Design a protein around this ligand. Structure first.
Ligand SMILES: CCCCCCCCCCCCCCCCCC(=O)OC[C@H](COP(=O)([O-])OCC(O)COP(=O)([O-])OC[C@@H](COC(=O)CCCCCCCCCCCCCCCCC)OC(=O)CCCCCCCCCCCCCCCCC)OC(=O)CCCCCCCCCCCCCCCCC
Ligand code: SF4
Lengths: 95, 115, 148
């Protein structure tokens, strides 16, 4: 960091870039390992007002597959609209 | 149309320099082989619907660059490849002939999950 | 007339009504029903500004807890639960949404009981909630700052 300036020019010149700006290892910048206690939020349906499970029944609201045709003038359709050709990159199209 | 684009961006698939008429002669061919399959067939009605309709502007509009969004199916050089695939299907289901009823009804309740 | 804050119309089960409702209503079954109460036994108990309504129904609902036979779960459990949360309401130990909960569990025991004592307990607190809602908020609000 420890490293004297003459070494730093050698590293900077050989790699063609400045490295003291950002280094592979860590330093004092990291958050201290004794962060204050948190106060985690509550659930959206944590209210003690109207909160009946009769409303949210994700497991129970599931329905067996819908019967559409069973063994026991027309149009032509596709399972979805054909995909759209996305444009090139705006920041850098040709790398 | 315009200048012949160098590559399609998909290796293996090359650029056809005369694409509009190749797409034409393909579309007639599938119309031709579709003559064999009788009228009541649904597959015939489906592709007799999208062939001539898609044969329409490729006959009328000659610019393949505009033909990209006429078919909304990507580059023309693989649209003809897809057209070939449709021709392969016409040959294939001319054997399959699935217009008969089911070969077999499903044995008892082999379906109906859960058990 | 100005003294009386509210009146128990016809019985303890029957929800009490204030002067704003009882200014013209006749003590008859049909008018009482549309007054969100009942004539019942015509037990008319008049109650004034000086006495607190929450304390008034506090003794009533405490009496109701002292008379549930405990046979069915809603009356055995709900009325006791009502007594505890309402006892806090006398001081004001709750949040705004607790009145809505006290609304909620009142409907839960309303009609689900074997007998008509359970919903007979729902009606008095139900009428208290619907009429003097701001009174509950301010007494509860007073609870917060005095015990800040
Ligand atoms: C090849 C060039 C000549 C030999 C190396 C010279 C050298 O390292 O000079 C110090 C110095 C160290 O720079 P650095 O590598 O950036 O230091 C990083 C930390 O500051 C380093 O901080 P630090 O606190 O770790 O520094 C303490 C360090 C200090 O170490 C030194 O100063 C190295 C010289 C020996 C002591 O000494 C030790 O760590 C003790 C253990 C020594 C191990 C054995 C060393 C053998 C040396 C050669 C023996 C004979 C061959 O050299 C330079 O700054 C540039 C190169 C040399 C220039 C002087 C002319 C030659
Ligand atoms: S509502 Fe009636 S039956 Fe149910 S616990 Fe109360 S007194 Fe018993």
């Amino acid at each position: 960091a420890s490293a004297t300036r003459v070494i730093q020019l050698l590293r900077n010149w050989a790699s063609g870039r400045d490295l003291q700006a950002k280094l592979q290892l860590r330093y004092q910048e990291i958050s201290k390992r004794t962060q204050p206690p948190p106060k985690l939020p509550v659930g959206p349906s944590h209210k003690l007002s109207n909160n009946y499970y009769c409303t949210r029944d994700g497991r129970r609201e599931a329905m067996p597959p819908s019967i559409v045709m069973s063994s026991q003038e027309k149009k032509a359709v596709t399972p979805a609209p054909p995909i759209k050709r996305w444009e090139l990159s705006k920041d850098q199209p040709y790398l | 149309a315009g200048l012949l684009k160098k590559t399609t961006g998909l290796v293996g698939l090359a650029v056809c320099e005369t694409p509009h008429e190749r797409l034409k002669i393909l579309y007639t061919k599938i119309l031709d082989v579709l003559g064999q399959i009788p009228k009541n067939a649904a597959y015939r009605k489906y592709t007799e619907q999208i062939t001539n309709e898609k044969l329409g502007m490729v006959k009328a509009e000659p610019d393949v660059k505009k033909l990209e969004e006429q078919l909304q199916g990507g580059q023309i050089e693989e649209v003809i490849l897809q057209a070939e695939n449709e021709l392969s299907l016409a040959r294939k289901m001319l054997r399959w002939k699935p217009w008969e009823p089911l070969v077999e009804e499903p044995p008892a309740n082999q379906w109906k999950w859960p058990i | 007339w100005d003294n009386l804050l509210a009146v128990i119309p016809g019985g303890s089960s029957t929800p009490l009504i204030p002067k704003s409702v009882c200014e013209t209503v006749l003590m008859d079954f049909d008018a009482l029903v549309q007054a969100q109460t009942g004539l019942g036994t015509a037990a008319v108990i008049v109650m004034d500004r000086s006495t607190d309504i929450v304390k008034a129904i506090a003794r009533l609902i405490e009496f109701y807890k002292h008379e549930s036979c405990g046979q069915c779960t809603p009356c055995r459990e709900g009325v006791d639960w009502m007594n505890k949360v309402m006892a806090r309401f006398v001081k004001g130990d709750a949040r705004p949404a607790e009145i809505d909960s006290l609304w909620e569990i009142s409907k839960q025991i309303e009609g689900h009981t074997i007998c008509a004592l359970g919903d007979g307990a729902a009606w008095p607190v139900q009428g208290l909630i619907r009429h003097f809602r701001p009174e509950l908020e301010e007494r509860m609000q007073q609870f917060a700052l005095q015990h800040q």
